[PDB]
A paper describes a structure:
The crystal structures and inhibitor complexes of two industrially important ω-aminotransferase enzymes from Pseudomonas aeruginosa and Chromobacterium violaceum have been determined in order to understand the differences in their substrate specificity. The two enzymes share 30% sequence identity and use the same amino acceptor, pyruvate; however, the Pseudomonas enzyme shows activity towards the amino donor β-alanine, whilst the Chromobacterium enzyme does not. Both enzymes show activity towards S-α-methylbenzylamine (MBA), with the Chromobacterium enzyme having a broader substrate range. It appears that the different rigidity of the protein scaffold contributes to the substrate specificity observed for the two ω-­aminotransferases.
Author numbering:
A (entry chain A), B (entry chain B): 33 to 459
The structure:
């Protein structure tokens, strides 16, 4: 069929010469777009010159030292300890072990349960798939493992009932309290959440949600962990998604955001309280000192430098983010089977619905999303279909003109979509 | 104070100008040695030119297609389905989930327990740490998780009593049968082992061990899994360690040996029975090659091509392997506190012992190993201490002269070690 032949900026090309507008590469964290020659050079040099680690060497690799130094400058107050891995899935798994070790060290070994959310996603390790709330992943491996619990997701469109979003955000956060009390606070180690659920369909919680979650976590002496694997490194306009929603996690996980997707890498960023805890047990100290594939760290360093020095993150907050959000809602809000148009910064979405009046979803959630996605692709546009949610997360460097080009095509596709719907009486 | 400044061939350099022999090949993984400029070029080109999706519409990324095509040529017959990951740890975790999903699809809901070995090592995830048998690891994330069991390792020097190695291989393999009947066969999904235990100290099992493990696995309808993360890609003289020992696994896992450590990557090679069983449910399907990274696949491709086309693996079997093994046994067999001199291909080891007569180990296993290791480093030689086992696995490209050079230095270090023992009355 059609193979990929080239990537540059926000586009990729196929073997037939088609230019494909990549409206989703940020879900794989390609935040600065394709074709960065300087990143390629950063990798080339490190691979030619240096070893890939070995030991005894009282030192941390110079590529890693530099990356760590730079990250301290761009992360929020209190994150000055970073543990490197090879992926977001590994970062999640390491985080689970850290959270449990922290409580062990505090002399509370029974505090082992982590609480996630249905439709949350935290990667594909046994630990991560257990903490995530995708039912199809739980079946593959008799998951979740012990010390994993789940609460319903803050999806107002489905569960918001007769409530305003804001009233719902309180109710949905209180589900965490209910679960903690059910399990017992002294068996609960942490609550873990993506600031905006990514793979679950860009579920943007109400403004009252995260503050209520945080309040509840502190009330019960439970750690708060953000999974920033999608939302970090400028996706919401802030450097990290938790900054946008105004909560303060005790740890947070990131992945290819570090490298804009150019090479595999992940990290766990550990706040002061937990860091002091772990080091006191002498734990994770070899990881903190020797973690990080130096080639990937070299690319990650060039990337984070670029995001800062080129003003890419600031440009999402001030310029392209507001432009995108306005243009997104302008384009999609009018369609008959489009509802819950949403987004922050450079992540945005809507849901294909049976009936906007009744807030009624299509049956066999996903079938209609697939149809819309298929139309997009026939028209040389990629966006992600998550059930009947259509989601977009383009490179952060996307211009105002590229935004319009993308939305012009998407608009044409929705017009076709609305017609195809009626034409088979699914409307 | 010193830092790494260069790697080339079998050598490393530090900031002081010191030339160091890398007898440990990074982390047993740098099989082609350092300084491959063609590898760096392969990464540069992919990073400059292409997107990073593993799949595009009906096709796979060209770099991945290429790697899989080449892998099919060098893998044992029947292993065409490969699932890519970012590390050996992720490969192990994916294997565990695959093993369990397979029995689910087969309608055997009880059949979920994986059996590993004490002193076995399968990575650092919750899943891999649980399947591994490192007692210090059994309480970082609350471990082992359920459906994990362990048998004793086939370590003749310690457990062999008054048996020949061949008699002991049968006894040590039958511990698996004893364990299966203790648990109940209906509950046991797989046995997993490194053909030779790596991090555990290059524990080479008797020739009788693997054939007997395999008979037992087939007798109870238990899957047989090889962890080739250290033994893979030519380390034993064969492409994979299971080929050397003459067993036929249903799946096997591989890590960065695939790329000689130049970039992070791993794989699960899935045999026909399990692949078909997973297809028969539609499980680990839509998103198979889709966990790894295509830049890493391009490097892995150049590496596997180099191992085949430059005759590196064949040279281990026919030339440098026999030489290393012969010369290793000449060099070390004579020392008063060195015993169990062993190895195959380009992995080899010996154990530091209190008394060769009684076969008595030093107390506080590890203390003496560290002492000997520090001597090596002071002498610009990297060899690994696992407890009181000393281990070596240099790049496979090491010349006969490089072999003697390494052994010349090692011999001098053992002379010094032997003096140090008496000069402390620890002889
Ligand atoms: C929130 C979150 N956490 C952890 C992971 C695991 O990261 P790695 O993939 O680096 O192991 C993820 C996965 N991140 C991810 C990557 C690509 C696509 C999509 C999508 O659903 O479109 C999501 C994720 O979305
Ligand atoms: C047998 C085995 N299985 C899985 C893993 C995990 O692979 P990754 O590390 O690629 O995730 C390993 C780890 N392999 C490994 C790596 C680095 C050092 C050492 C050492 O003990 O010197 C061993 C291993 O030795």
């Amino acid at each position: 069929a059609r193979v990929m032949t080239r990537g540059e900026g926000v586009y990729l090309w196929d073997s037939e010469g088609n230019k494909i507008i990549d409206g989703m590469a940020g879900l794989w964290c390609v935040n600065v777009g394709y074709g960065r020659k300087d990143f390629a050079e950063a990798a080339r040099r490190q691979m030619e010159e240096l070893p890939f680690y070995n030991t005894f060497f009282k030192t941390t690799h110079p590529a890693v030292v530099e990356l760590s130094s730079l990250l301290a400058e761009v992360t929020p107050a209190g994150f000055d300890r970073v543990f490197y891995t090879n992926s977001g899935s590994e970062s999640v798994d390491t985080m689970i072990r850290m959270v449990r070790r922290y409580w062990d060290v505090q002399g509370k070994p029974e505090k082992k349960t982590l609480i996630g959310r249905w439709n949350g996603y935290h990667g594909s390790t046994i630990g991560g798939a257990s903490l995530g709330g995708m039912k199809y992943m739980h079946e593959q491996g008799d998951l979740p493992i012990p010390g994993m619990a789940h609460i319903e997701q803050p999806w107002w469109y489905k569960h918001g009932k007769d409530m305003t979003p804001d009233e719902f955000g309180v109710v949905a956060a209180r589900w965490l309290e209910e679960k903690i009390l059910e399990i017992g606070a002294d068996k609960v180690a942490a609550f873990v959440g993506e600031p905006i659920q990514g793979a679950g369909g860009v579920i943007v919680p109400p403004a009252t949600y995260w503050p209520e979650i945080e309040r509840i976590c502190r009330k019960y002496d439970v750690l708060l962990v953000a999974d920033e694997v999608i939302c970090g490194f400028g996706r919401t306009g802030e450097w990290f998604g938790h900054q946008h929603f105004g909560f303060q996690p005790d740890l947070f996980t990131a992945a290819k955001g570090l490298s804009s997707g150019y090479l595999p890498i992940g990290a766990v960023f550990v706040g002061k309280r937990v860091a002091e805890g772990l080091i006191a047990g002498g734990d994770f100290n070899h990881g903190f000192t020797y973690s990080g594939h130096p080639v990937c760290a070299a690319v990650a360093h060039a990337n984070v430098a670029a995001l800062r020095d080129e003003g890419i993150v600031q440009r999402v907050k001030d310029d392209i983010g507001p432009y995108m959000q306005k243009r997104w809602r302008e384009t999609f809000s009018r369609f008959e089977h489009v509802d819950d148009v949403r987004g922050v910064g450079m992540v945005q979405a809507f849901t294909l619905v049976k009936n906007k009046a009744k807030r009624e979803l299509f049956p066999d959630f996903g079938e209609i999303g697939t149809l819309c996605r298929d139309i997009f692709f026939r028209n040389n546009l990629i966006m992600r279909a998550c059930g009947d949610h259509i989601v977009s997360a383009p490179p952060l460097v996307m211009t105002r003109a590229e935004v319009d080009e993308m939305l012009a095509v998407a608009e044409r596709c929705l017009e076709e979509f609305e017609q195809t719907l009626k034409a088979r009486g699914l409307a």
